[PDB]
């Protein structure tokens with residue numbers, strides 16, 4: 001996250017870190033046994049880390065649970081990042097508490113102008129590199145589909161939305177991939193892609209979770 005703030009330990013209790021020996025992506029806990037992330041985060045040998053603040057120090061609220069199964073959306077296109085969504089099933093159910101909690105799926109798509117919270121352990125610099133150890137937060141609005149299409153001509157599908165600031169300076173970034181965009185207490189987005197980070201007229205692009213609720217629920221019911 002570029003231009004964000006330190007969330008505070010366990011203030012984003014649905015945030016997960018996907019670990020393959022190191023943090024490589026975020027995700028969101030959607031019930032005691034399932035995580036949603038970006039399909040571009042797919043790899044084998046995922047450990048889900050819940051209750052994290054400092055990903056390099058055991059602080060006491062962590063749950064580390066191996067993935068038993070990953071399900072990439074059947075229509076994920078790695079070239080266009082259309083349908084950039086994946087489900088991860090945990091080997092055992094998380095213990096839910098004030099610091100480890102699921103985030104509700106939306107019943108409705110959020111409108112442009114809606115304020116959202118984006119969070120992650122990604123790069124904090126738009127140029128060069130500095131990876132924070134503790135979770136970073138950004139409040140950003142959802143942008144109109146027209147401003148999103150103008151920023152990324154020919155690249156925005158109906159499964160994507162833009163959020164952030166056209167002036168630049170505040171954005172999700174490398175390592176934030178897969179993480180949550182929460183709006184009005186619902187999961188609305190997944191950190192998916194952009195042209196760099198925090199660049200003028202290049203807002204972040206997010207997977208539009210409200211389009212996937214049917215697929216998520218039916219997949220969870222059967223797996």
Ligand SMILES: NCCc1c[nH]c2ccc(Cl)cc12
Pocket residue numbers: 171172173174175176177191192193194195196197198203204205
């Ligand atoms: N808002 C940008 C979000 C994003 C997701 N994965 C990335 C990889 C590299 C860079 Cl530079 C940026 C990103």
Ligand SMILES: [Ca+2]
Pocket residue numbers: 052053054055056057058059060062
């Ligand atoms: Ca920790």
